[PDB]
Here is the input.
Amino acid sequence: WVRYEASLRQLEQRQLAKSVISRVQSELGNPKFQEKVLQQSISEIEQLLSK
Amino acid sequence: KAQPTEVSSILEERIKGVSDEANLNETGRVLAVGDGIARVFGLNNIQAEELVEFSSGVKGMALNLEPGQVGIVLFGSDRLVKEGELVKRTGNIVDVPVGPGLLGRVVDALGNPIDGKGPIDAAGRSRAQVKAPGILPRRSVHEPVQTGLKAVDALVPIGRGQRELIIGDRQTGKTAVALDTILNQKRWNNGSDESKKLYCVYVAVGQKRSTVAQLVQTLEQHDAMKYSIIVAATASEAAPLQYLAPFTAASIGEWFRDNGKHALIVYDDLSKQAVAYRQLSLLLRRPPGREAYPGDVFYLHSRLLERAAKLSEKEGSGSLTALPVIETQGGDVSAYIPTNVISITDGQIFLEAELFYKGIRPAINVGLSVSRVGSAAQVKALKQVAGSLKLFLAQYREVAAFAQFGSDLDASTKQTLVRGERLTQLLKQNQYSPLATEEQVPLIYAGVNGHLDGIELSRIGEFESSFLSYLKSNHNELLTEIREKGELSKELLASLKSATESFVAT
Amino acid sequence: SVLKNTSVIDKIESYVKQYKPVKIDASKQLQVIESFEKHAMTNAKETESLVSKELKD
Ligand SMILES: Nc1ncnc2c1ncn2[C@@H]1O[C@H](COP(=O)(O)OP(=O)(O)OP(=O)(O)O)[C@@H](O)[C@H]1O
Ligand SMILES: [Mg+2]
Here is the structure.
């Protein structure tokens, strides 16, 4: 009853792996790619302004 | 399991924090990638041997620092790397985590938990290339390492901080002696006296994953994994990882050595270390040496092995015992790497297939198998108190020295013949059955006062087992007295002789 | 506690406890075991009486 729980741990991560496939497929179909460049712009400003 | 979800969330937030705090400009650009090699334009101020990250996510070590472009080996496959990729600099030399949470876990060359039992609790982080202790900060080897093998205990002593080589041929029993020692250390690894604890650390460079799976199943069956650490470099991993793994394991053991404890390293099949280094050097266009090996393989092996030592009382009197393994092709010990390793170690344990097929299961060639330490690093009970355990080496040399060329001349020759053949049949042992000094002493002591009267050769094995029974029953006082005090006193010699002759009459 | 999906251990722990008195010892031999001995007293003293008499005789 322990390694079944351990296998339950391992299998649960495995459907989370294909969950990321569902997650990542959700990542590629957004206008955020347009919005994400502004995220770099504000971030890179915060980066070198620190120096 | 929602807990790993927020764990991953905070992982990703610190991932962002770390990634967007670099603003690097010396981050180089990949010019070309070879078979696990990548020359990169950039990294003007890169240190030697320094770790790097590729934009894909593969690690790399800075071997060649020629002007302009830098030679980077790959800890992994060249699968995901292309030209014109930004190469991140770690800022530190290649490092491996060290600590006491390593026990019971299996990791890779870098030190990542590969067994799949969660993260690793590391008390520190040490270099893969650390300097060996100096001439003064060390002490001579005096405490003996109890192998559990009678032929490896009473004939070729090993101790804390020595370097004993298991030289031999393929599938002769090279790993058997190491695993037997690991199992034998369980007797004192379950106690409280830390001066007698021997944690085991083992390298697996080149062995297939199935073999290491069987091995770890073995240590957990006999309940030895709790004090053992396994680092694995299968042939599937890239050559840099295999080349690096033994150094990381050396640092792992040096943690215990410098912390005052005692540890044992098994450098299993150090030859494939050499072939991985060959692949590295050849792929870097470094001029080769003899028979296509890189020149500095002797330095490679010396720096690795000499890190094992017995420290002196000032620093903590820690120890680290090296147990390297070298396989030879057709018994050719004149081969280059075999010669280097026989010249680098503090003795050797020769195993050959011919004695293995002769019945001798340990297959220890006592003619060549020698230890640079004798009386030192040996339990006294297996020493001058037993008398002949100072000089069985001469006896086994002479018995081989009169087999047919020194044909039996008189009754003395016949007596020596019978004695020697009875002893050689006595030294036989089986794998997965470690033994202890307190019952080594009676068996070989019987080898001086009544051994030719053994009940024919095919039945001397149950003779030794029944002798052990007759001494563990009704005679436990002898076994105890010789096991705590570690030597045989005059009255103790008299009692042992009396018991031996009593069972001889039996 | 290593099992977060226990669901049977308390039943198993109780199953150990309900059978905690597994089975008593069997000291049944109290009439035949000494019957071997009663022959042992008979023949040994028959032998000892004879040998003691004969050694002096
Ligand atoms: N004492 C022993 N009793 C019985 N069999 C033994 C004994 N020692 C070794 N063997 C057997 O000899 C074979 C090789 O032993 P071992 O596993 O130590 O390999 P090795 O010499 O290290 O070789 P390799 O380099 O191929 O791993 C195995 O089949 C093993 O079972
Ligand atoms: Mg082996």
Q: What stands out?
A: Residues B 170-176, 327, 361, 430-431 surround adenosine-5'-triphosphate (ligand 1) (CB under 6 Å). Residues 70 and 101 of chain B are 36 Å apart (CA to CA).
